[PDB]
């Protein structure tokens, strides 16, 4: 598939819709949408491994990481496939996302369809925190909203 979409919901007020497009195989993924109800500022933003939301965002498992690498930012070379860095929420709690990534994909081994996209309570430190959790999660904190990534029309 070349188009995907995701509805993010969670415990609190955070919600949104994110779209995906890679218009040619193994090319760059354009991710765009907007998320409301966030605290003004930066929030971690990754694709987690499982699209199981039976137990909320908890059952999504960890960052999508087929290469068994440490946590990093999206520009970094040492990275999880699912590391998409941060989204920034404005003074009304709205974060308009428009991002390009080329390590995620809508087909092949690093396909993200059927997995879970997650917005986080705190900013992702992109692996540079200086502790061990920073190399796992970016110290991004709890999962405010999430959804399974489906084939979109």
């Amino acid at each position, epitope marked *: 598939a070349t188009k995907a979409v995701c509805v993010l919901k969670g415990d609190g007020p955070v919600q949104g819709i994110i779209n995906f497009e890679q218009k040619e195989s193994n090319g760059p993924v354009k991710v765009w949408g907007s998320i409301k109800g966030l605290t003004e500022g930066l929030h971690g933003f990754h694709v987690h491994e499982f699209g199981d939301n039976t137990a909320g965002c908890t059952s999504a498992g960890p960052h999508f990481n087929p290469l068994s690498r440490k946590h990093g930012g999206p520009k970094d070379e040492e990275r999880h496939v699912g590391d998409l860095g941060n989204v920034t929420a404005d003074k009304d*709690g709205v974060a308009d996302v428009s991002i390009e990534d080329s390590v995620i994909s809508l087909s092949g081994d690093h396909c993200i369809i059927g997995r879970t996209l997650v917005v986080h309570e705190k900013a992702d430190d992109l692996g540079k925190g200086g502790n061990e959790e920073s190399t796992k999660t970016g110290n991004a904190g709890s999962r405010l909203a999430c959804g399974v990534i489906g084939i979109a029309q």
Partner: nanobody
Amino acid sequence: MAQVQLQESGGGSVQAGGSLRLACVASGGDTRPYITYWMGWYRQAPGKEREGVATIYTGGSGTYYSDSVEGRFTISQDKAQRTVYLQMNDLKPEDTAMYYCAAGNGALPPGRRLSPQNMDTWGPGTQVTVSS
């Protein structure tokens, strides 16, 4: 922290042209820090519908005002104390009303943030009377 509860204070009597500050203290409810609200100030004058005056996003800083009060009222918050202040200046006689605090969902979209029907919690009210 049962359910969210709002308490207004600071209403009184003032002559036209005067000032007033109202405060709305929030207590209880889900106290996790990412729980955001549009908080924020409504009026009901004799014989008229309840109307929104000002609102503020407790998870950030955006503020929005009704036309009738833009320029004269200002809304602010002390997030650590869950208090939202309405600084009312250049008061006119028609600002006389019972003033209510109200909390709405933090994901409220533009144009519902300051509408009474989309408010979830209301305070008891504090009366403001402005003399001609």
